[PDB]
Amino acid sequence: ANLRTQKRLAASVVGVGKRKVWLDPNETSEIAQANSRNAIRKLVKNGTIVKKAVTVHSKSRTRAHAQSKREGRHSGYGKRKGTREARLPSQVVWIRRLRVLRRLLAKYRDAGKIDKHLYHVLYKESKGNAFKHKRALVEHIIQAKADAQREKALNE
Amino acid sequence: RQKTMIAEARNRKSLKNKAIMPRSKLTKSFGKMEEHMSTLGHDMSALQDK
Amino acid sequence: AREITDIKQFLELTRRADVKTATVKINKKLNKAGKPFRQTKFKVRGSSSLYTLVINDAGKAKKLIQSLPPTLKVNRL
Amino acid sequence: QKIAKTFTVDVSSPTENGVFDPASYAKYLIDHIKVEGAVGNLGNAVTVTEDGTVVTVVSTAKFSGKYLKYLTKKYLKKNQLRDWIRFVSTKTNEYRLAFYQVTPEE
RNA sequence: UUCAAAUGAGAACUUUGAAGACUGAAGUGGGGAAAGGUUCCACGUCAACAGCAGUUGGACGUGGGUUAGUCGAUCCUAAGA
RNA sequence: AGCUUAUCACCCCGGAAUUGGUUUAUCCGGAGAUGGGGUCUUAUGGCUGGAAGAGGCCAGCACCUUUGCUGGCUCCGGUGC
RNA sequence: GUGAACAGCCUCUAGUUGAUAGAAUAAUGUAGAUAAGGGAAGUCGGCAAAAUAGAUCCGUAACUUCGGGAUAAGGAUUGGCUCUAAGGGUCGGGUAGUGAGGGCCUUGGUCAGACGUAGACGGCCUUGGUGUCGCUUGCUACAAUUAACGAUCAACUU
RNA sequence: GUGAUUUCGAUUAACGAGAUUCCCACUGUCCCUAUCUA
């Protein structure tokens, strides 16, 4: 027998590659009689032709290693191969930080914690890289409001 | 017995290249059944009748 | 395919001169994580467009089915 | 909140054949069901009952039919019942034990 | 690369199954332009050819197969003629 | 296919120094800023119709067969140099 | 997946297993390696091999057209594991206080719906309920100069 | 016709599959060969 055509038709009918169709070595004459896609479908239905399962590519070790990197392992100087800026762009870091600062400033200005003039001062400073992070900006705002209060009281 | 079972599973399983065929699609035999049930120590009358 | 909302427009359309066939489709759905309820779609086949009317009330759907013209040929499901 | 999801397991075919133990099945389920990461924290959250033919699991803390099938297949492998018992789902959350397709040799 | 079975007068090389490998998504994957012209598919077949072989083949014999208002051409103008 | 959906842009009210608004990137305002209310393009997304009847994944069914049938499920999210 | 990475290496989907075969394993040849002591003594000629190499921190000369030279040169470090610190988003303003508004209104009240003992939904209302809680506007009252905090959600970097 | 630029016909940083003499490091180039794999 020559079941090359039958293998091709089984691949097309089941929808998988020729590498995933199984032809029963015992039903050779029956498969050889199957010259049509309807016959191939009947053989698939009654089990003479079977679709094989995919070869497993499990991500268990990948997920384990990702969890380890989340826990903070495998992040040493012997593990780094690209430069620091190639690993993470300092421009991206700056854009994140300045957007955080502008967002907090706008929120405080809208809520009324600060006035327009203090907001303008702090906006220029955050653009000028005065504040290292959100906590630093918050504490500096608190101190500056205290200074304004004391100055107004002393001028009173 | 457990080391022998390890050897049997080793020779049967080869998954780096292809997957094991599903027992749902495959079909076994009374020869593959009654001997296993005997080594497990069970009755055979119901299976013989069926 | 067009969805029609007014029942009066649906009936005039089902009496339109070019319309010959309609279809009544039954769906089983859920209302706000509620009990499985019935949905009836009336699909009237026009020359240009298939017009669909969605009714979520079974009794109203039945009474509309009674209200349908006799000459119109209805295909159920 | 406290929705008691109930899973039923009809083992009628292997039991009436006479080569499956519902008693051992329920014992394995109680022993090996993990709740909150450990076996033996079942109380007041997961309950398992026998009825001779149908085994009921009423749980209200992270239990699924996939987990039930996993535990049942572990039990069948342990008792060497895999190659002739299959765990199938008839309706949703309603499962049963059947047998593999065995042709007649003749 | 290897084991077994089938086919066959004849099998290291055809077919199926089982294993071992490989190309490793800038592919030994899937499509086109151009070019070729039936190489596409099936059945049969091995005198010659595919630098061993051959029951295999883009080989030989015989048949079958390419369906558009919407995809292209067709229309427009470019350098140019 | 219907409804809806926007940066930009434009309109109405009002008149700004303690100048304010504001992008990652400093530009914008008496040639009318900030602010409140609007109008617009529909890239794009969403809901619905098309449409579940399709397709997919399962279970239970016959039986020499050039063969069909019956039930289920086909849901809800998250994230990012 | 690793990794700075369309690199190299391994894998999934798909595809292929084509290249004449078998038996032996001397020298030689080609390709690839190792080597005591010495270290260019070899050769026209350090030809070829070897050595160097990623990243982090420190550090860097003469000369210079001031832009460079520069990765100059020259040092330290790099695994695994358990920790510590740092880097964010969305929602949160009130009861002291008057009275109405939206919806399946627990129970209780009137009008009141076609089909196959059952009868939903639905066109109307509440001072109640989930000193009379509350989801809504109008407002006096520290509205926040401690929201300087809390509830909730998520990524991988140092 | 000359080919940057500067400075005083000379000079010149940067760069080069351009040319020459050495240095460290390195080594089977060698003393002097030997062995392993395909």
Coordinates of C-alpha atoms (C1' of nucleotides) in Angstrom, one line a residue, chain G residues 30-42 46 50-51 63-65 69, chain H residues 4-5 12-15 25-38:
Chain G
rU30 C1' 42.6 18.4 6.2
rA31 C1' 39.8 20.5 10.3
rG32 C1' 39.9 21.0 15.8
rA33 C1' 42.6 20.6 20.5
rU34 C1' 46.4 19.7 24.8
rA35 C1' 51.3 20.0 26.6
rA36 C1' 57.0 19.7 31.4
rG37 C1' 61.1 23.3 31.5
rG38 C1' 62.5 27.6 28.5
rG39 C1' 59.9 31.9 26.3
rA40 C1' 61.1 34.7 19.6
rA41 C1' 66.7 31.5 21.0
rG42 C1' 62.5 30.2 15.1
rG46 C1' 56.1 37.3 15.9
rA50 C1' 48.0 32.1 22.2
rA51 C1' 46.6 35.8 25.4
rC63 C1' 48.9 65.7 22.6
rU64 C1' 44.4 68.8 21.0
rU65 C1' 41.5 72.3 15.7
rG69 C1' 42.3 61.4 22.6
Chain H
rA4 C1' 40.9 70.4 5.5
rU5 C1' 42.3 73.8 9.5
rU12 C1' 49.3 70.1 12.8
rA13 C1' 44.8 67.1 16.3
rA14 C1' 41.1 63.2 14.8
rC15 C1' 40.9 58.8 11.4
rA25 C1' 51.7 40.3 27.6
rC26 C1' 51.5 35.8 25.2
rU27 C1' 52.7 31.7 23.5
rG28 C1' 54.5 24.3 20.0
rU29 C1' 57.6 29.9 15.9
rC30 C1' 61.3 27.2 18.1
rC31 C1' 64.9 23.7 21.7
rC32 C1' 61.8 19.0 20.2
rU33 C1' 58.5 16.8 19.7
rA34 C1' 54.4 13.9 21.7
rU35 C1' 49.2 12.7 22.1
rC36 C1' 43.6 12.9 21.3
rU37 C1' 38.9 13.6 18.1
rA38 C1' 36.3 13.8 13.2

